[PDB]
Symmetry: D2
Subunit: 243 residues, 4 copies
């Protein structure tokens, strides 16, 4: 049965609004958070595949899970259009019963390299999950594996990337500029690398839009935009390409 | 708690892939349909509110929930953009599944008006869900509660819409044509009706688009649209030059 | 004739890339600015209708020119997805031939209330446009007409808004809080006002989204922001409504 | 200068309403079709390149231009969202225009292979334009230059694709079935062909949505076959690829 394979009775019975007279607009609020959380589960799943592909020098496949990841990210961004229909007037009606962090979101941020050892606490409330979270904190990021990939093929990548303490969020590296300069200037020769650099900018960019949208919705519903970056050098290089 | 208010342990434990050496793209298949089903649940919730508001002549309240419905419908449509990344080569790896309806989906169509009693039988199981169909099947459609709305305000609505066998899917009626003709050719006096009409044309189009996408996505994955909910609404376009 | 009514010969004859050996990616770059510029012309047109409607107290007409404005604004936003495909490497090719402000953009910004008397002189060259621009600079904004509208129907709008120097950009006014506070608190009595507030929030939000996309594309293309606001009190009210 | 590079004086003087009295909604009608027309111009420009790259066996390159091409087709589709705000009430106001086809639209159907000689004598007016149509009418389609790409790398391709009357619209070839069957059934070896296959299914699908959309907006504005298919066996193989 369609309902049986997708476990719809379980899925469709996870919505328990807790407002006194059952406010009409509470449902939107729940669903919206639930669809998002499910997409976060798909994202992590694909992204994990990409890291393995890179590790095994499998470009097209890894490129074939990053393409999907972008689509999913574009969805996490599109969904805000519906929550935008929630007005302050409607929110007053059930906001009361509320008082909010996502272990899946943090997982995704850890995966892209934005690591923060302090984040492990506040989550050891789920050891099994905190364990999955710790595993990522201790291993290279998507960006770092990309770099470990470049070194495996003749690109001047600083030795410290072969092995260091991965638990510290990567720091912008000047010595990386020329590596990315050479790639963009010779595209015929470095087409594989070139394609991957662009896929990564897409991923970090679609991701920024998602965070920005998120903040505008919070403004219009609850009222009173960071500048963090995942791939510094890929963005910095823009100012020097074409020496 | 975040995870407690949303029931995340239950939600995120509803993904049961079943491949014997387990397949990678299977997960996409699942969560694709589950988020879709989740929006359908939110869509019905709003659509019902639209009917109640319509019965009370609460025009602005009604027009609104429809606005949200339009937005939800747009999401159901835009959403196929990720399933389209599933290739026949990938699908082979787990195609050994079934061959696939959707009670929730059917509920919305009944609600809009495409009534079909023969459907109640494809869900011989879980009579609670089957009971939901029957209950909405006997009530007037979203479109029909609109015609009764118009009757309450002096428009030439045929008597039969006051009471009849709601089980039978609406049938296009030529006698409505002049009613919508007066509305579109005098938009200032009838702005409320005018706006609701356009709201309805939006909901059908968006829905139509969604069905079209669904079919095109099926074409590329598995390999080898005349229904119309509000006929008179689309028909009048042809003669609104009176 | 389809081609003659739209004046397509004139239209498809306005693309003159000046890259030395005709660089393949210049075309995207030009039409991109052009479609954007055509949408900006439609926007100003509708927005102008909106001002008139509000002055004449015609709510639903106002509303339904504002509904289209949102769509056009969403178009200016979506459009960036195509320019994002322009890579630094492709940009290098014709980068060196171009050496960039829109009079229609500033017109749109003036309309919404972000008035800046200094802009005038930067357009001393097409006195015709400068004059169009001055007309707007001197008249109340879309937002200001909205407030003047509320004053016409029993809302405690400060007397000063009946007449003053519209040359200065609107300044956040805290005496406006209780006015917008009361609206959101009895949706039933103020449904008209309630809807316009939300249409206005939509317009500023969609507009912010557009400015953000713009900036992210500049980053991925040229590399190395402003949190202005058009309707302050409509956004500030979020924090008090209901307490 | 900005307005000089883009030729805005010409671009923004290409809107000639014909209403007397001037009708508010005529503008939307015009800019809607002109912006659409500009994108088509960029769409052709990229497609022609995709062909040349395909001729040169330059896979990644033919492929990038196709990605941008997909983005442009998406814009053409998403774009009807603003014309849907045009209502029968408004349309009556200027309806008196004419009973209405795009030379460029046909140029692109031809490029994709849906060729038709009777479709020439209908642009009976600027020969130079119908000339652009013929030049492509007798040239292989994007799909056919693809089939020839496949022939060069050892794929069982019928001889006729080597040379024939290109003026005729492709006819679904059953002997192509086992060819695509092998590519899909062994993606690692044929990753490039596998990629190009999928890229084509995207272009056709996005185009299908664009056509469906157009028809739906026509339905809601004016009043009362879309069974064409550019790459048939590509869609047909889906039903037989079974290990
Ligand atoms: Mg299962
Ligand atoms: Mg529940
Ligand atoms: Mg819940
Ligand atoms: Mg399951
Ligand atoms: Mg496919
Ligand atoms: Mg003309
Ligand atoms: Mg030019
Ligand atoms: Mg400017």
């Amino acid at each position: 049965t369609y309902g049986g394979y997708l476990r719809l009775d379980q899925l469709l019975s996870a919505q328990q609004p807790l407002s006194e007279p059952a406010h009409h607009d509470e449902m939107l609020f729940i669903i919206q958070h639930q669809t998002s959380e499910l997409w976060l589960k798909l994202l992590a799943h694909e992204l994990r595949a990409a890291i393995v592909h890179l590790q095994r020098d499998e470009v097209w496949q890894c490129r074939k899970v990053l393409a999907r990841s972008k689509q999913v990210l574009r969805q996490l961004t599109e969904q805000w259009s519906v929550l935008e229909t929630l007005t302050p007037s409607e929110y007053m009606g059930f906001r009361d019963v509320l008082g909010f962090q996502s272990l899946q979101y943090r997982y995704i941020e850890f995966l892209l390299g934005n690591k923060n050892p302090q984040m492990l606490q506040v989550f050891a409330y789920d050891p099994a999950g905190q364990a999955r979270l710790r595993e990522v904190l201790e291993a290279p990021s998507l960006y770092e594996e990309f770099l470990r990939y470049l070194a495996r093929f003749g690109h001047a990548i600083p030795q410290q990337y072969q092995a260091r303490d991965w638990t510290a969020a990567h720091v912008a590296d000047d010595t990386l500029r020329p590596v990315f300069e050479r790639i963009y200037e010779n595209t015929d020769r470095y087409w594989r690398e070139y394609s991957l650099c662009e896929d990564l900018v897409d991923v970090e960019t679609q991701f920024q839009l998602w965070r920005f949208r998120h903040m505008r919705t919070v403004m219009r519903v609850i009222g009173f935009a960071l500048a963090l970056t995942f791939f510094p050098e890929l963005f910095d290089v823009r100012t020097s390409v074409g020496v």
